[PDB]
Amino acid sequence: RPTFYRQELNKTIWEVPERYQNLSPVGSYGSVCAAFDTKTGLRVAVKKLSRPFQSIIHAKRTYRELRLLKHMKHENVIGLLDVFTPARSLEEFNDVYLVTHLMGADLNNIVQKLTDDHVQFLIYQILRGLKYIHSADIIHRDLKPSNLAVNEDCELKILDFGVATRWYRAPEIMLNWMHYNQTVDIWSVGCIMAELLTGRTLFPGTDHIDQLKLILRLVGTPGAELLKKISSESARNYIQSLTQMPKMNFANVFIGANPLAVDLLEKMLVLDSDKRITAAQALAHAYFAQYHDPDDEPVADPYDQSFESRDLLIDEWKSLTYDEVISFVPPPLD
Ligand SMILES: Nc1ccc2c(NC3CC3)nc(-c3ccccc3)nc2c1
Ligand SMILES: Nc1ccc2c(NC3CC3)nc(-c3ccccc3)nc2c1
């Protein structure tokens, strides 16, 4: 066990290993401090979870967050440098702190007027991380510029938790489809890419009804092939009742963009999610010609999501979390 030290940071009592020095609050789910990690000489983010075990729901979320972070080992996905608690046993375990690399800024923070070459590289790395995430049978579901961290070097990582979420949300989620799949995240990337190319939010809906309206304006109203797959009578009838909007020609919307970027946008922003390009397929698209390497786009180890279907007591989730803190193995130095 390391020596721990205590301090007050903007209302909170932080108790951290001596390893982490010069804590400096950066934002407040829980709050975050920048720190110097004396073990590596790198700046790190230390996140103290707020009330991690205060309900069955908080408790399972805490476990979920730790399981996910522990799993991610990819250059374009946030990973866990450390997890620790000041507690010496399960019985006094009440606090969890998570340590990750400190990233420069978020993609929202860097959006003024982006060059096509920057767009290629940034979207490439998003798709590379998503390939990896999706290969674990995980759906991010909340991809938006504030959940993407970027270095000054333009290196990007997808974050679990860092502008309205809805603006980036696939139409099938707004419509409450229970069986939406991983291409919801490709929809989101499409929305992000469009925004990077034009400097404007592609769909700034004021709410979900407005959001779908703006969406169908561009992608047009569902064809016969999509309608016959919609299990909800009310939703199909609603969809079918709207004024028929033809799909816009994207060349006439993203005027002057690289035609390859326009073409990839066409394959991402397909209304029918069964026809949307996957992350793995997007990577091989011609737009990423100067970056794509089929031998350096790895997939993830399988991830056991079976706890998701379990209903456990608070102390059991809390105990499973403690087990995960105890079994944590630091990533290799350098
Ligand atoms: N195989 C599929 C493909 C796309 C689907 C989709 N897409 C949303 C219209 C854009 N929506 C729905 C659905 C089902 C119940 C209630 C509301 C929506 N199902 C879909 C099934
Ligand atoms: N007359 C109707 C009948 C059904 C509807 C429905 N059905 C989905 C199963 C919930 N969803 C929506 C809607 C519209 C915009 C954004 C999100 C959802 N509108 C409906 C309007």
Author numbering: 5 to 32, 35 to 117, 120 to 170, 183 to 354
The article reads:
Interestingly, several MAP kinases, cyclin dependant kinases (CDKs) and glycogen synthase kinase 3 (GSK-3) contain a hydrophobic pocket at their C terminus about 30 Å away from the ATP-pocket. Recently, Diskin et al. confirmed the existence of the MAPK insert in p38α using protein X-ray crystallography and proposed that this structural feature may “fine-tune” kinase activity. Structural biology studies of p38α in complex with β-octyl-glucopyranoside revealed flexibility of this region and its ability to accommodate small molecules. Although, as yet no clear biological function can be attributed to this hydrophobic pocket in p38α, potent ligands which specifically bind to this allosteric site may offer a valuable starting point for the development of chemical biology tool compounds for the investigation of its biological function.
We initially screened a small molecule library using our previously reported FLiK assay, which detects ligand-induced conformational changes in the glycine-rich loop of p38α, and weakly detected binding of the 2-phenylquinazoline 1b to p38α. The bound ligand is stabilized by a complex network of interactions. The primary amine in the 7-position of the quinazoline core directly hydrogen bonds to the side chain of Asp294. The quinazoline core itself forms interactions with the peptide backbone of Lys249 and Ile250 via two mediating water molecules. Furthermore, the side chain of Trp197 stabilizes binding of the quinazoline core via π-π-interactions. Interestingly, the side chain of Ser251 forms two water-mediated hydrogen bonds to the peptide backbone of Trp197 that may further stabilize the conformation of the αEF/αF-loop and the flipped orientation of the Trp197 side chain which is adopted when the ligand is bound. The cyclopropyl substituent occupies a hydrophobic subpocket that is formed by the side chains of Leu195, Leu232, Leu236 and Leu291 in the back of this binding pocket. Finally, the secondary amine which bridges the cyclopropyl residue to the quinazoline core interacts with the side chain of Glu192 and the peptide backbone of both Leu291 and Asp292 via water-mediated hydrogen bonds. Using this assay, the initial hit 1b bound with a KD of 2.4 μM to the p38α MAPK insert. Although initial detection of 1b with a binding assay based on conformational changes of the glycine-rich loop supports this “cross-talk” model of allosteric modulation, we were not able to observe any inhibition of kinase activity when testing this focused library of MAP insert binders on p38α.
